[PDB]
């Protein structure tokens, strides 16, 4: 599982003290690229947002579903980054086809979870706006935590996808020791959904 999950080109960005296999690439995007992404996410039609209890999100590329995803064309402003991460060969030899945008106001997070079998077992996430701390849990207290800085790419593969839980604490500040105040964070999670329906086909139920 671990040998299969290594990405030779990302070896210099391996987070060696974290569970196998996590990559963290600082400055994966420029400040101008980050600003344009934030502008496009915020200028999206109001109906693109789903309000949850603890955050709000957008699905781009379709709604993943165990009976098959009805696809939607990704816009070029997201396809550019889907291509960049798919060129790192992260999704088993086929390109990513889905982007989940999360917005976290200061104080918001996400309960510990695994991303599960609707996706090829790789998470790639580009962070925008503000830092956060990602907590990892054995399937309590976190086993490891990682600071995610704006404009970074995080990649979780192998057991870091299939065994470990990840979460973000509903916190306003992160003490590193020194102390970072959270702003609004927007994350772009780029994954490959293997079960996609042909164009025009609907399944009921």
Binding-site residue set for Fe cation: 113, 115, 166
Q: Which is nearer to Ni ion, 167 or 197 (CB)?
A: 167
User: What is the spatial distance between Cα 189 and Cα 113, in angstroms, rounded to a whole number?
Assistant: 15
Q: Which residues are annotated as a binding site?
A: 102, 104, 113, 115, 166, 185, 187
Q: Which is nearer to Ni ion, 36 or 131 (CB)?
A: 131
Q: Which residues are annotated as a binding site for 2-oxoglutarate?
A: 102, 104, 185, 187
- H/E run at residue 131: none
Side-chain half-sphere CA neighbours of 17 within 13 A:
4
Kindly state the smallest distance separating residue 132's Cβ from Ni ion, in Å. 12
DSSP per residue over 17-68, as a string? TSSSSEEEETTSS-HHHHHHHHHHHHHS-GGG-EE-SS-EEEEESB---TT-
User: What is the spatial distance between Cα 150 and Cα 34, in angstroms, rounded to a whole number?
Assistant: 8
User: What is the spatial distance between Cα 187 and Cα 68, in angstroms, rounded to a whole number?
Assistant: 25
Kindly state the smallest distance separating residue 31's Cβ from Ni ion, in Å. 26
Kindly state the smallest distance separating residue 108's Cβ from Ni ion, in Å. 14
Q: Which is nearer to Ni ion, 30 or 143 (CB)?
A: 143
Which has the closest alpha carbon to 139: 117, 113, 120? 113
Q: Which is nearer to Ni ion, 115 or 174 (CB)?
A: 115
User: What is the spatial distance between Cα 81 and Cα 48, in angstroms, rounded to a whole number?
Assistant: 19
Kindly state the smallest distance separating residue 12's Cβ from Ni ion, in Å. 25
User: What is the spatial distance between Cα 104 and Cα 82, in angstroms, rounded to a whole number?
Assistant: 22
Which position's Cβ is nearest Ni ion? 115
Q: Which is nearer to Ni ion, 36 or 159 (CB)?
A: 159
Site residues (vs Ni ion, CB under 5 A): 115
Q: 205 CB contacts (<8 Å, ≥6 apart)?
A: 67
Kindly state the smallest distance separating residue 113's Cβ from Ni ion, in Å. 6
């Amino acid at each position: 599982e671990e040998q299969d999950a290594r990405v030779p080109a990302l070896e210099p960005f391996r987070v060696e003290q974290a569970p196998p296999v996590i990559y963290y690439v600082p400055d994966f995007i420029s400040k101008e690229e980050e600003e344009y992404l934030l502008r496009q996410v915020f200028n999206a039609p109001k109906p693109k947002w789903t309000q949850l209890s603890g955050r709000k999100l957008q699905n781009w590329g379709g709604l993943p579903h165990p009976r098959g995803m009805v696809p939607e064309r990704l816009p070029p402003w997201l396809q550019r980054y889907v291509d960049k991460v798919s060129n790192l060969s992260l999704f088993g030899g086929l390109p990513a086809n889905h982007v989940l945008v999360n917005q976290y106001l200061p104080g918001e997070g996400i309960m510990p979870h695994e991303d599960g079998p609707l996706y090829y077992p790789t998470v790639s996430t580009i962070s925008l706006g503000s830092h956060t701390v990602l907590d990892f849990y054995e399937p309590p207290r976190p086993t490891t935590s990682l600071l995610l800085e704006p404009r970074s790419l995080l990649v979780l593969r192998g057991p870091a996808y299939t065994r470990l839980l990840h979460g973000i604490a509903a916190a306003r500040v992160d003490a590193l020791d020194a102390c970072l105040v959270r702003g609004t964070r927007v994350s772009l999670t780029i994954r490959r959904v293997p079960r996609v329906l042909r164009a025009g086909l609907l399944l009921g139920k």
